[PDB]
Amino acid sequence: DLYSRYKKLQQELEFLEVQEEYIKDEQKNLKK
């Protein structure tokens, strides 16, 4: 069932990147 593994890996990747951009923005804001 490699298809499911690839699908969940992609989901994890997108979730991770959105978290990352959020953290970047939060740190930027906290600087002020």
Next chain:
Amino acid sequence: AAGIISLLDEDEPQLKEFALHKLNAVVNDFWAEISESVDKIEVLYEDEGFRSRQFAALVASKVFYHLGAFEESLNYALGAGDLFNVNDNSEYVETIIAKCIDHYTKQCVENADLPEGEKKPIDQRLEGIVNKMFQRCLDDHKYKQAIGIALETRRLDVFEKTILESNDVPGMLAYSLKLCMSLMQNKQFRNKVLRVLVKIYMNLEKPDFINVCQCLIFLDDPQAVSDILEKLVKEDNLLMAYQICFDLYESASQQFLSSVIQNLRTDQTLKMIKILSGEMAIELHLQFLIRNNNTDLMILKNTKDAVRNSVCHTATVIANSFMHCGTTSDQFLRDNLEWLARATNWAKFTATASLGVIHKGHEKEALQLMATYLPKDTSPGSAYQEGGGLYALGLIHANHGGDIIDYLLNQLKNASNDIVRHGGSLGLGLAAMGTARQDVYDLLKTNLYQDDAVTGEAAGLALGLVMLGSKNAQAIEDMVGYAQETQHEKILRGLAVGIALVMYGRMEEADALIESLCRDKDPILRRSGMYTVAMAYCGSGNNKAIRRLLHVAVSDVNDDVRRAAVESLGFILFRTPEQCPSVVSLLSESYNPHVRYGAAMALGICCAGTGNKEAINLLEPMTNDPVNYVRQGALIASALIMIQQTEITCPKVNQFRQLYSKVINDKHDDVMAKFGAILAQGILDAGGHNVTISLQSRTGHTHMPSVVGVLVFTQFWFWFPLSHFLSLAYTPTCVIGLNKDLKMPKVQYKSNCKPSTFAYPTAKAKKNPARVMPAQLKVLTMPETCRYQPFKPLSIGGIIILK
């Protein structure tokens, strides 16, 4: 290699064939020669005179291995003509054809999302090779791989014919749609795939009603379920009939169950209507609940002797309400008549509401039961109890339609506009939730337009409640216009959640309203917009929603907006609890106390009742924050998370328990801080360790009542009386079994595990439904030793009928 270029300079078809021979013989042993002759080969590319004109594209594809340009290989294959299909496998030909296949799938999805047609078809050889590889997969009998290509191909034809991969229909062929549910989001694609697969299923010999319920519960085909039920009725297999009826009733929204009942109506038919009727399942559930209770008076006594003579009176009464929610056992309170005789006229409203909550589900006798404590009988001068009576009456018939709706309508019609109408209108709206009826909508709008503050907020909450997820543009425009038109906070605060609850469950469908509310200057309107975002995207990981919400929480100055945003974040990611703690972690440590409080609440709601073993891990340190606000936030979050758990299942449960006690025992602690501790205890032991919170049905259908209850609870930071709404979000884990229409079964499933968890105050277990938890439910063993057996497995609890 110089011969290659030298020969190519010569012009002769035989020369071209010799070039073919040498170049396909040496592709990489000499690469710069062809790399520079790219010009000659590409000019020969387009030439009808060239006998091997397709061989020019063959050369392109083969000997552009160094040339990594993907599009180059794409056009090379497109012009390959014939050799593309032949090259089933080789050193690198397989790689290029696989790349072409993935690009073809990308193009297919890209042009298929285009729904209005006029999609530019790709070169035919590309789909030809795609189908050839699909045939190779069929030969390899890799059903999962084939279906995965089909879906990523965004073509339902291959998806359908993939069922011929093995033609056994044990699992995936009839049960991989569950996997699809898990790992896909496109609703447009969702409906088509669902209908196709249900057609495939009922084409099977036995139309398994379990997989037939997909149309009703996910694809919302009330007519279809009605038709299949009619087929069953004429087929005379009432067993399956009422099995599917109960399944849908416990895993479907009433909005279309009404249409299903209408279709069924226009004996077997009478029984069908009854089971698809006023909740005989609720009747038997309540019978089950009263037949089994595990409640401790000593907890009530420990609360009593720790009385603070302050607001936590309301917290105590609501905690006792949670204790026996629907148990109809007030003796724990009937014993002492001073807890309800030492409150301000306003808290007593909450007290009588709690009294009503304790008595939940009788319906039939509820009229006389409430009249027993009728406001005129209890205190005519206390109009607070007058309103609380109607509020309790409405609470009793939570989602339970009936004449109570019209009765409450009449009562509200003939009553005071403000002093009492708050609770009466709120209860009427709750009892007619999602009913969409105009006869109640008119009254609610009139109440909203009575420019009153004390009762108008409840009026607006009810207005939102009745129009649950209706997307009725008329209602949303009315409410939003009225929101900015008035000059009261309470009215506007209520209207916020009212709007949020108006339209929901549409994912990214009401984005216009979302944006309009988000850009509004008023902070409270922004909070309303965030709640609307949460409710619309309930139970999904829409990346756009998460991004917008996180940005709002980071930026918006108004701490209230940030808190609402983080609550929404917790709401929308409950189906994937494992990930929620990860995001909430950073919020756990922020300068803003409100941010941390909302983060704690978000974690609590996201993890629901299942203990991730990290949620508690983060809460524990968070359970010592200096700010009292965070203190009660953490207490409530921990109580919500740990509900139903056991010592062995979660080693930490004792600590918090003890912790709770101490925070209701120490006097130096802030009274407002402790106000959460009593509610925490009540939640943790709510409903005699039987009730449970769960927003997802066993069939996957999301529980609207649970979502609404948790939302109102979250809103209860700006109002206490609203806490009672958590009663709606209480579904006990008892496993109900019945062979015949009313034949109680003498089954005793063998848990085949140490009771330990079962005996919460030798692997085996016996019992009718009992306080058996989903974790213990999955381990239960079905006792085949008896004559009658369940129709469907006992993998997970619910109402499983027997034969």
